[PDB]
Amino acid sequence: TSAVQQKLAALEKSSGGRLGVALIDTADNTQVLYRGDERFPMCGTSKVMAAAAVLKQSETQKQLLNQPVEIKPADLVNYNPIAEKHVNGTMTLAELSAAALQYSDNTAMNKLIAQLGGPGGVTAFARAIGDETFRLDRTEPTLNTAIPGDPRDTTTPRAMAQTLRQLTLGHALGETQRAQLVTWLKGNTTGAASIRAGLPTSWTAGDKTGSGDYGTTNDIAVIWPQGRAPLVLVTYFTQPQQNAESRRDVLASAARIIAEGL
């Protein structure tokens, strides 16, 4: 148990919830894990895998990102700030990817999933890039039920950090596709209260949040610290009762402990 791990355990203790953290410091490829091999519900953090899978398809189906996809009134789910503007019209897969990632649009995510042949198509992509842990089982919005002990739509912090590193800094995607994914993550609108809140102001980052029942509050990020090689950081948090409140502050605290421990 390292000093950082002990600090994360203390944070967890005062949160009353269950915290999972995985850091990969690309300066030396070292990792810091806290419940790194335990499963957590991904919620919206799964949107990165779906968007990446579509980017991979676009490497060989060249005009795929410009392909129009019909948005019908029946497609709307619980949160669709971008898709609802286009009901009875169309959005391209690039527009759907940007909406899913940067606005966490759930209808947009469902269109990515459908393009991949269902939730299993997203899992298949994960397996293709060496992630043997990730599993997507349902569409939006039920993939956010986040029931304790339920393996559906979960992953481990270790697996997600390794995957995010491969996708954003490694070669799981072609260069142009990797750059697109990084651009989308850096333009996220929903992350200032989570991991990024715990980082020094001078650092830059891209991230994808997730939220669900059981007060499930998640974030996965690629970070560029001032004067250092980039990091990949995953912070997952989930609570004992279905109606628990969101705790983005716990993710910010975890990120601050990680930054102070570098």
Ligand SMILES: CCN1CCN(C(=O)N[C@@H](C(=O)N[C@H](C(=O)O)[C@@H]2N[C@@H](C(=O)O)C(C)(C)S2)c2ccccc2)C(=O)C1=O
């Ligand atoms: C089947 C019943 N059921 C299970 C629970 N559930 C969700 O927990 N959905 C979650 C969901 O769709 N979460 C999405 C996600 O994790 O990307 C988006 N992130 C939420 C956020 O950042 O606050 C959102 C409300 C912008 S939607 C949700 C979490 C908190 C508040 C509202 C929705 C549902 O939507 C739902 O219908």
Ligand SMILES: CCN1CCN(C(=O)N[C@@H](C(=O)N[C@H](C(=O)O)[C@@H]2N[C@@H](C(=O)O)C(C)(C)S2)c2ccccc2)C(=O)C1=O
């Ligand atoms: C000769 C060995 N060999 C080399 C060629 N190959 C593949 O190209 N497999 C591909 C593979 O296993 N693709 C996966 C699969 O077939 O479930 C997933 N299906 C694709 C789709 O539905 O369009 C995906 C892009 C969502 S990934 C692969 C894709 C990306 C990264 C690595 C592998 C093989 O699998 C294979 O057997």
